[PDB]
Amino acid sequence: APVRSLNCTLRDSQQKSLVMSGPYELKALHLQGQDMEQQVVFSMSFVQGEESNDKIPVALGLKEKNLYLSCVLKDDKPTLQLESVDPKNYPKKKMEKRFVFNKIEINNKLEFESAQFPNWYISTSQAENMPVFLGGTKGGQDITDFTMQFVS
């Protein structure tokens, strides 16, 4: 059948919101009140891939944009990019592996691991107005945990 998707926002565990930073980048900053309309709304698709109780393969598209978070090697490093696709063909159930994140439940938060690059995670910096990036540490310094808000 079709692929199933939910509209949502994400916030890092320090409660920073995600906004656009030019056409192909996201940044995280502390946001409240009027400025909260600036936050990115995702379409989270539930895609084909290896699955367990607490590990669910998803794609993260931007709502009503032909843009997806993807994980590629850039200058020889695993790298988070926003990638354009053909809007006739997306979303789909069998998303290409660079688009797939393993959603994980851990102590009432979420981590998003790259399916392509094991133990690389969607990450934010402690500092305000810095890029969202792919980090090879779910350890300490950079933030790898999130809450989800379900949007109408």
Ligand SMILES: O=C(Nc1ccccc1)Nc1cccnc1
């Ligand atoms: O919403 C969550 N998981 C989920 C998301 C989409 C579909 C099915 C399950 N987890 C969660 C837990 C604590 C704070 N924020 C989010």
